[PDB]
Amino acid sequence: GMIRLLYLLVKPAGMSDETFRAECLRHYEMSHDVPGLHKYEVRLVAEQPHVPFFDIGHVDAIGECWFKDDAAYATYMASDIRKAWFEHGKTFIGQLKPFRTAPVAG
């Protein structure tokens, strides 16, 4: 019954691919201290290669957040540590708004 949020990340203007990757790594390390957050993952898009193609913009990385329940999410939203982590994501890894996903079973 996990809550899951997925972010499509675009590299901020003015930084190299190397800096971006390092900012993503740091963002991952910082996630371990964020209250309410069960798990975080960030991966680079390495490639963007028989069913019609779907045109969306260029994406550089993907971030995903897991929350155990609504209570955890509330703690996460009220947390100053979470807030500082968002500022880092926003400014340095291009975090905008996430897709909220749901399981396909019942």
- By CB under 8 A, residue 47 contacts its own copies: yes
The torsion angles phi and psi of 11, rounded to 5 degrees, stand at -65, 125
- Position among 40, 42, 65, 76 found at the interface with its own copies (CB under 8 A): 42
Specify the stretch interacting with its own copies by CB under 8 A; choose among 5-13, 32-40, 73-81: 5-13
Q: Contact, 59 vs 42, CB < 8 A?
A: no
Q: Can 88 be counted among the known catalytic residues?
A: no
- By CB under 8 A, residue 34 contacts its own copies: no
Interior angle at CA 28, CA 100 and CA 105, nearest 5: 30
Catalytic residues: 27
